[model samples]
Target: DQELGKQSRRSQDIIKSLGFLSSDQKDILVKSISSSKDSQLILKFVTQATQLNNAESTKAKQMAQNDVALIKNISPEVLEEYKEKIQRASTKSQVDEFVAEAKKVVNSNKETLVNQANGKKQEIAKLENLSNDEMLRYNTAIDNVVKQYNEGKLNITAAMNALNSIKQAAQEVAQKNLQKQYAKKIERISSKGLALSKKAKEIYEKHKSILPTPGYYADSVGTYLNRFRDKQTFGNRSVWTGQSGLDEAKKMLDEVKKLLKELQDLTRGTKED
Candidate 1:
């Protein structure tokens, strides 16, 4: 009876440590140990269960470590802490708890990156100067990167690089659009100047005899016309290719408006004479 009592206590201890085994399975093993008369057979069963429990714990720890290794953006200290927890884990369920927590961190990291990329996309989409086709292309590229990351085709580093590249490309495109707008503004102002010069020429031709000597207004108009025509200086395409180009274009437009007002005053003076 003392031997049987010792065997029962040993089996109970083994069952308590085997957390992976269900309650019913533990009960069955306990019953087997109690009913069996052979002490050697009971010892054998205890040994097998101990071996099985150790093997399961080892495999679970390895799996947890592998899972944690795949996670990105976690600090090294946190990673080391998780590794320590895994090492200390004795049962399969204990190891799985750490794995689940590590996976949760990774999932949240993914969500933050994805949301940041989407926010950038939304901002770029609002740029009025970007063409629809170009916008669609950028949208598709961003979407592809996000999809690749979700599908596990890209690691965290690769996903971040791809998203940053897309953002840079979009910024460049926006800059180019600004340059284009400046160029268009310069062209519009030049056309207005040309038309004014034509009007000045006609007025000079019509009233050349009555006009004062040296023809100040007419000469000034010709000089202004030549300035507008000189693409190398005032109307240079190269100058109108960046942010500074916007300032130059605006200054030129203002000068053109002033010239128009001067021409109107000249017309009135000519009429009075």
Candidate 2:
């Protein structure tokens, strides 16, 4: 009987499974797995397996004993049924194609991985109603990936893929948390926008009040602020998913920040005549 935990994690390691099979051999495996209608899982498994390949230490191998056991659980007969395809299958390398993308993720180092872990944790910590178990396990999972990478057990591509997944999850969690605190975000954005717009008005008048100036120099800060404020709303629930509306709102807020920076530059310049 296979250990359920061992089999579960091993099934997720595409790189390891492929290690025994040739690039051409992977062709059949990909076709078979894809046909299983779980292509994404296969892709994710590839990432995990490739990362594990980069590990350097005996401890890392020892830790992977369970993975080995899980793989062994799949009988030689059943495994060979797929392996048999390699002798006959013509080439169109699916795993190789996917691995090329994984190759693009690039470069693993302990410090960089640590920094990513810290940044993700900080963001996750900001979320309310977050349980201790959730935070600890999240950090632990990140730590394990980094450690495996630092040991030269995980490759840069795998390390980056893992980190990217964590970063994306953190973003989703933060966005969901924002919905709970939407009123607060709106308040802060509104206050900042208003303050910046007021300052922009003062600077505009100081420069253009006495001239026809083609009406261009006249205070148009109000228009920009209204556009910014229009988007600073807490109304959209769709944000809990893709947050397209929330992202649009944030983009508009960024426009306001940039304008504020420009206004500051105008005020900071040397006084003239």
Candidate 3:
């Protein structure tokens, strides 16, 4: 009985020395020693317990590391959140569950981002007014973002940021191109209006003595001439405004052509006299 007591005490000492085992595991090992026949038997059980603890801990550590690695390239905030959850997990199943959830969220977010980028790309393609250089620059920028995300060089957050910035820049360029087209059209009409104004003025100067002063035709000519003089002022203001102003400018140009036709008829009547 004394020898058995000594062996039990020795087993307790061994269990105590194994700081890596949980308290429950230590208690179970100590209790099992009561069935052992000798110190050698106790020693064998202690060795086996130590080996099992080491094997389980090593496997758990490896599984935790692998799960954390899966989210290493995700946004910093998400990576840290899942990393903490997986690390704090007590079992392999918990870690696997967290990793699977993380992947689902990441994939959903990526799908939305890619869809938005593709929508912007299609919008850009339909913009025929953009110069070839502008088209190439925007297309290349968007394509690069897609390639980087596909190859895993950029994470979800980074790819979205790049795509959004490119969208803004391309929209700005499209707006500028539209404005330039409007300005060019307005300038061409202005040139034609000025030339007609000069012709009307010369005809009035040549025949003003024969025409009735302050009469209908003379008043009409004077009013039309004043409109031509105000053309530069209104043209400058409307060119930068929107499409309504553009339509007004086109209407004004048609009126100028009609006035020129009236002036030519007057000049023909004066020649007959």
Candidate 4:
């Protein structure tokens, strides 16, 4: 009855019943079917029964519906990773701690979500030999997520919307066969992203003293205003379209925000010079 266990029931059944097949054949057969909805859904039901998050359980359903966007179109592995990361078990206190982080992620909006999705896209493209059926669905799901995020009419806060959307996407579309591996990828990304984030943070800290003090680093605003004025200077020349030029300029402006955050935290203000 169980689709998978310590040893997969579906796989063992195939091996026993199809005695003519070689070990390789049996393994391949199992791999394909384990990637199926039957295996994935059954696994999710088991996971839901064990995990105790009211918010996550609800998102799990949405994730299964392939609402995760293009990510759901790729190998079920990515989706599995996503689900496991968010639905992990916790003590009551731990669960409460996560609620705050979850709120932060959920409030993040379309642009940030798309950025996250693009990273997933790059990751999946690295893993090859996916079936056409798998790739098609995966891409379709991805495009939908992008379109919805970019164009969807909604009143949701940027963070919460993206967080809940991913939560739902993972629960609905992610599965067991690839879940463990996907979770590992999630862990690696988290670690690496944290490190890069720290580097960027350091860059801001290093430059903070000179920024607002005009004589210290006078080139900041005029240099920025140029990119704000033209496409070529911004690096969106032609490779990417759809207002990516504008987005690039905007993201640069975010650096100013990060600087402001540090200044605000330290009680430092701008110098007239």
Candidate 5:
């Protein structure tokens, strides 16, 4: 009974994959497949039914292609662009890859693009809700594009380019304001600070003679004041500090000394009066 059920069930599964079947056709098929005891007869019927369905589906698709107006079941522009590529695809995987990439673009712009097609120009075209016609157009276009790309008649890249023609509307006013604030901050301080840091290092090198004396004063100045010249020098890397913990560096130019008193705290017994 289990084996019999499997053979009977496979006929409907094969029919479903071929194309959409009429209710009457599906009903007649269900009635026709009952109580098949012969395994060889069941196999032959399943194989022949699948091939016939395939041939019928292919014929219908070819008819759709013959009518120029019917071809716009997808977008006219996208169809034109990908037509060559669809025909050029050599395998099902390549066709699937092209369909995947095309769907991403379509889904991303589904709302705005659909609105544009329907003669509506709204700034905010959210996809959370869609009209039945809008959804149909979107679904049909994706299906047609994939079919064309798989057949090697459509170019995925060209389809992408066609879709790119319509850019999304501007950001919300609030987002635009926030973006401007960040842009101004990056230009004002960060850019100027980087330029000033370089100049400060060069100025210090040439003016080393003006520093204090012990003759080793210049060496001490290089040890502390020259932190800018060394990468990651000031943050935390010393014998008293743990060697096991690695640390990232702060920029030396970010530091400032307060009244030379901090220097006494830094060197401790290493400096002479």
Candidate 6:
């Protein structure tokens, strides 16, 4: 269920697209989720978090205008940002589209988080095997932080702000590092590649040897390729490149190349010649 964390994270991000938490709020949540013992528990928290976040959307629709307006008056700039984004999201499909995209983010992030958490566990285990002196040094570092908190040496609000600032700095570092990679694949290139999906039978005939791959590729022609692969694997989308004799690899690659190029463009990375 590494995937569950990804789903949870995606849900959190989707809600973030609509609105976000104050830092302490975010930290509290991240800390809590990071503590989840299992994927099922992680999903539970995810569901609860999503339910609460979505609840805002549901209740806000029927809220007394003056009450909300009074609150918004304090942050007109922030309110306007959401107002514009939501206004453009008039269609149900549009709302669902973003949510679906966010869902992908959630599931994918959960997977990522799970992997990270497992790594952390391994590191902790290694730490457990450390020399006494080394362990004491590490313990001292942790104790110093805790001691400050306990002795009121660190102001609560200030400490939280500092923590958030540190988090922000870390994220900035990541962004800077990521900036070295990728250019956006021109939409025209991506679309042309995807659009060139040479019909259904073309997939079957061309990739009879790699039947399942071609068949699934055709299925994914209109759908996102990664997601299509997922559906083929998990959903009952039939064998795409298995012994079941499905043949759609040729057309599938036709669409996937667009995805690969688009991904290359979207991310920061060296473009292959």
TM-score, one value per model: 0.60, 0.27, 0.63, 0.19, 0.28, 0.21
lDDT scores in order: 0.72, 0.52, 0.71, 0.45, 0.44, 0.43
lDDT of 4 by residue, 112-151 (tens): 6667667655554444434456555555666666665444
| Candidate that scores best on TM-score | 3
Q: Which residue pairs collide, candidate 2?
A: 51-154, 54-152, 54-153, 54-154, 55-152, 55-153, 55-154, 56-151, 56-152, 56-153
How well does model 6 score by local distance difference test? 0.43
For model 2, state the Cα shift of residue 252 in Å: 2.9
Q: What is the lDDT of residue 61 in candidate 4?
A: 39
TM-score of 2: 0.27
- Residue 189 displacement in candidate 5 (angstroms): 45
Candidates 4 and 6 compared: the better one by lDDT is: 4
Candidate 3 local lDDT, residue 158: 89
The alpha-carbon deviation from the true structure for residue 11 of candidate 1, after best TM-score superposition, in angstroms, is 22
Task: Give the runs in model 2 whose Cα sits over 4 Å from its true position.
Answer: 1-178, 209-214, 217-219, 228-242, 264-273
Select the stronger candidate by TM-score from 2 and 4. 2
Model 5 misplacement above 4 A: 69-273
lDDT, residue 184, model 5: 48
Candidate 4, residue 93: lDDT: 35
Q: lDDT per residue, candidate 2, 1-273, as tens digits?
A: 234344434454453354434455445544444444444555665554445444322233333333322432232332243334322322224323322322232222344667777787677666664457766766777878777765556755587688778767756765675565764565565556667777666666675433345165343576655545555334342231234544555565676577667656655654531
lDDT of 5 by residue, 208-246 (tens): 344344345345444444343333254564311122111
lDDT of 6 by residue, 37-131 (tens): 57666666666665764665444432322233343112343334334444455333444444344435434533443344344334433532344
In order of TM-score, best first, we have 3, 1, 5, 2, 6, 4
Best by lDDT: 1
Q: For candidate 3, give the lDDT of residue 61.
A: 51
| Count: clashes, candidate 6 | 27
Model 3 alpha-carbon drift over 4 Å, by segment: 1-58, 61-64, 68-80, 90-93, 150-155, 209-231, 234-245, 264-268
